[PDB]
Every structure is written in structure tokens, then in C-alpha cells.
Design an enzyme around this catalytic site. Structure first.
Site, PDB file in Angstrom:
ATOM      1  N   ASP A 196       0.704  -1.093  -0.186  1.00  0.00           N
ATOM      2  CA  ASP A 196      -0.027   0.162  -0.045  1.00  0.00           C
ATOM      3  C   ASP A 196       0.881   1.279  -0.109  1.00  0.00           C
ATOM      4  O   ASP A 196       2.299   1.266   0.146  1.00  0.00           O
ATOM      5  CB  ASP A 196      -1.014   0.212   1.212  1.00  0.00           C
ATOM      6  CG  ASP A 196      -0.210   0.089   2.694  1.00  0.00           C
ATOM      7  OD1 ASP A 196       0.340  -0.713   2.901  1.00  0.00           O
ATOM      8  OD2 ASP A 196      -0.905   1.200   3.407  1.00  0.00           O
ATOM      9  N   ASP A 198       0.979   5.071   2.022  1.00  0.00           N
ATOM     10  CA  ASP A 198       0.734   5.839   3.081  1.00  0.00           C
ATOM     11  C   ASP A 198       1.038   7.344   3.077  1.00  0.00           C
ATOM     12  O   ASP A 198       2.129   7.541   2.476  1.00  0.00           O
ATOM     13  CB  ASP A 198       1.138   5.155   4.323  1.00  0.00           C
ATOM     14  CG  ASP A 198       0.855   3.820   4.752  1.00  0.00           C
ATOM     15  OD1 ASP A 198      -0.189   3.372   4.214  1.00  0.00           O
ATOM     16  OD2 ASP A 198       1.822   3.106   5.436  1.00  0.00           O
ATOM     17  N   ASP A 267      -3.646   4.696   2.087  1.00  0.00           N
ATOM     18  CA  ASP A 267      -3.964   5.186   3.557  1.00  0.00           C
ATOM     19  C   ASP A 267      -3.746   6.477   3.873  1.00  0.00           C
ATOM     20  O   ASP A 267      -2.476   7.052   3.577  1.00  0.00           O
ATOM     21  CB  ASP A 267      -3.467   4.107   4.698  1.00  0.00           C
ATOM     22  CG  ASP A 267      -3.860   2.495   4.536  1.00  0.00           C
ATOM     23  OD1 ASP A 267      -4.854   2.259   3.770  1.00  0.00           O
ATOM     24  OD2 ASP A 267      -3.273   1.598   4.891  1.00  0.00           O
TER      25      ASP A 267
END
EC number: 2.7.7.31
Length: 343
Positions: A196, A198, A267
Site C-alpha cells: 500500500d 501511506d 492510507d
């Protein structure tokens, strides 16, 4: 110089001289974690972490003298790797059915330990059988995890993380033009890949209502653009959003079609401007580097460190910081760069 037991008193770059040892130890920690043997897991993680900081490869058991976090169980794993070139213990875990299933099920976004145990105890072993079962019911997070499975299990690369970075800044400055957007996680520590991307968002001028509503506005903006595939918010103790973004290939400037887009886990974290140094320190990781930062703060300094503050218990005062360097200095620690936090 004696090697510290705390990862925050060690410089750990991505140059690992002990991958033969640390890969075996990480399998052994992951196994315990999926069995909820937290203590045995944390013990494997500390041994793995200390060997990642070594500037030379272990070639004999003598090379192990003076190294902390190397218990008797861990030493027998090290010797086995010195003798055979492989860990019979890690190979056993790799061949274990519970490990194989738990690793496969939790590889689906939305699936944690309680869902993976449930499916395993129902006799399921493959995602194909899970997905085609007419009796199973799934959460909205799991359906997204299954829908975008292949894109989500594919590594996010540095050009993709930058293409996502642009989309986050563009969306953020639409509502708070003075907002600072920072890429955190493994990418800040110099990783080539991640699962992912962030970001930490903060604003000097924003009010309480403005910082509470920004993540909702950003996501509504992506939703209007047709870029939002999934979203989930989490109230303040920071305002967080967990998304799945549609990343068009034409936005990716790499050395490298069949569907010109990739689903990416993004995120976002909004934090009050005066807590930004603490949030950056906390969201940069690695997970072991944070645990040791907090452990050192408590045991060595009688201080309480978290993602929003540093409290001195002796002086009865919160310690202010406008940068990570200031937090390190308050802790009585030499500054460790983000690329030396890969503990």
C-alpha cells in the site's frame, strides 16, 4: 561499540547481509502471529531485526557472540542454517497446512484471523472454493479484497506510489491549499515496493472542522472523478481513511496493456499541525522500530511516546517537537534517518 537491544539505537538499511537467517526467522514469527503466540512472535522479530542491522554475514556460531536478542531457540535455528544452508524449522512451517491457509486467506483484503480460522475449520483450503461457495457471506471489505485480488497482491512500485502521491496532493490542495502531504511507511524508508501507499496530511491554518471533514471531501472528490473503488473511515486517535484507488496506467511514469488501470491500497492520515513530528515518526515505521522507540522511551527514559505526543513522567510535562530530530534529541537518542529504520 556494543550492539544495543533497541532497534532505535541501531542503523538498519535495506542492505541485509543475513537474509538467509532473517527470512527463516520472519517465517517463524509469521507462523506464531497466525497462531496468536504473540510472545514467541515478538522474540523471533527481535532476533530477525538485530541481524538485519549487522554489517557482515554470520558464517559461524562464534560470529554470534555479544549480539543481543539471540535466545537459545534462535541460536539452534542459526546453527541449522550454518550447517545445511536451510532451516528445517522454517521449511516445516512452509509445508504446514494451517500456515499455508492462514497466509492465503489473510492475503485477501478484509480477511483477518477470525475469518481465516473460520474458513479453515470449515475445510476450505483455496480462494476458488471460498469465492464459489453458495453459503458463505462476506463483509463489504472482503468483497473489495476479492474483486481487486490480483492487483492488490501485485507489489506497488515506486513510480506507482508517486502517481498516487500526485492524486492525493491534487485532491487535498483543492480543499486546503496550504496542506502538507507526506508519503510515509516503507516508501519513506527507501523501499522499492509496498502493499500500500501511506500519506500523512496536515495543515497550519486549518480549523478543527476543516481537519475533521478533509478526508471525506478528498474521497467524495475521487468518487466524482470515478477513481474511488472502496473506502472506510475511522474517527479520531487520528482521522484515518483506508481506500482502494483506480490508478490509470497513463499516470505512471516507469521504464515499462489490457485494462489501463491498477487497484491500489491508499492510507490517509490527517493530523493536527502541532502533532505532525510525532505522527510522521509513528507512521514512518518500521513496526519493530516503533515498538523499540516506545520500549526505550518507557524503560530507559521514564517517558511515554505515542503517535501524537511525548510525555516526561519525572518532569510532569509534554515535550514539544516541530521535527523527528527534536523527538530523538528529547529521547537522548542519536538521530536515525528514515532509510536506517528498516528494523
Amino acid at each position: 561499540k556494543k550492539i544495543s537491544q533497541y532497534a532505535c539505537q541501531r542503523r538498519t538499511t535495506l542492505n541485509n547481509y543475513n537474509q538467509l537467517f532473517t527470512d527463516a526467522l520472519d517465517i517463524l514469527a509469521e507462523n506464531d502471529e497466525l497462531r496468536e503466540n504473540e510472545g514467541s512472535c515478538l522474540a523471533f522479530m527481535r532476533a530477525s531485526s538485530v541481524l538485519k542491522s549487522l554489517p557482515f554475514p554470520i558464517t559461524s556460531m562464534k560470529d554470534t557472540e555479544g549480539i543481543p536478542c539471540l535466545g537459545d531457540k534462535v541460536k539452534s535455528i542459526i546453527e541449522g542454517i550454518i550447517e545445511d544452508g536451510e532451516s528445517s524449522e522454517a521449511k516445516a512451517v512452509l509445508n504446514d497446512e494451517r500456515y499455508k491457509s492462514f497466509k492465503l486467506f489473510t492475503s485477501v483484503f478484509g480477511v483477518g484471523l477470525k475469518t481465516a480460522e473460520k474458513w479453515f475449520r470449515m475445510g476450505f483450503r483455496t480462494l476458488s472454493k471460498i469465492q464459489s461457495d453458495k453459503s458463505l457471506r462476506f463483509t463489504q471489505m472482503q468483497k473489495a479484497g476479492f474483486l481487486y485480488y490480483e492487483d492488490l497482491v501485485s507489489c506497488v512500485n515506486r513510480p506507482e506510489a508517486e502517481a498516487v502521491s500526485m492524486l492525493v496532493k491534487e485532491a487535498v490542495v483543492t480543499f486546503l491549499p496550504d496542506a502538507l502531504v507526506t508519503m510515509t511507511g516503507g516508501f519513506r524508508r527507501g523501499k522499492m515496493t509496498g502493499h500500500d501507499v501511506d500519506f500523512l496530511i496536515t495543515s497550519p491554518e486549518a480549523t478543527e472542522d476543516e481537519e475533521q471533514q478533509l478526508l471525506h471531501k478528498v474521497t467524495d472528490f475521487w468518487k466524482q472523478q470515478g477513481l474511488l473503488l472502496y473506502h472506510q473511515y475511522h474517527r479520531s486517535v487520528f482521522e484515518r481513511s483506508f481506500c482502494i484507488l483506480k490508478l490509470d496506467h497513463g499516470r505512471v511514469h516507469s521504464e515499462k496493456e489490457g485494462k489501463g488501470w491498477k487497484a491500489i491500497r491508499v492510507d490517509l492520515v490527517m493530523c493536527p499541525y502541532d502533532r505532525r513530528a510525532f505522527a510522521l515518526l509513528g507512521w514512518t515505521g518500521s513496526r519493530q522500530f516503533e515498538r523499540d522507540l516506545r520500549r526505550y522511551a518507557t524503560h530507559e527514559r521514564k517517558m511515554m511516546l505515542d503517535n501524537h505526543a511525548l510525555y516526561d513522567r519525572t518532569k510532569r510535562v509534554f515535550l514539544e517537537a516541530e521535527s523527528e530530530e527534536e523527538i530523538f534529541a528529547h529521547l537522548g537518542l542519536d538521530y536515525i534517518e528514515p532509510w536506517e529504520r528498516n528494523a
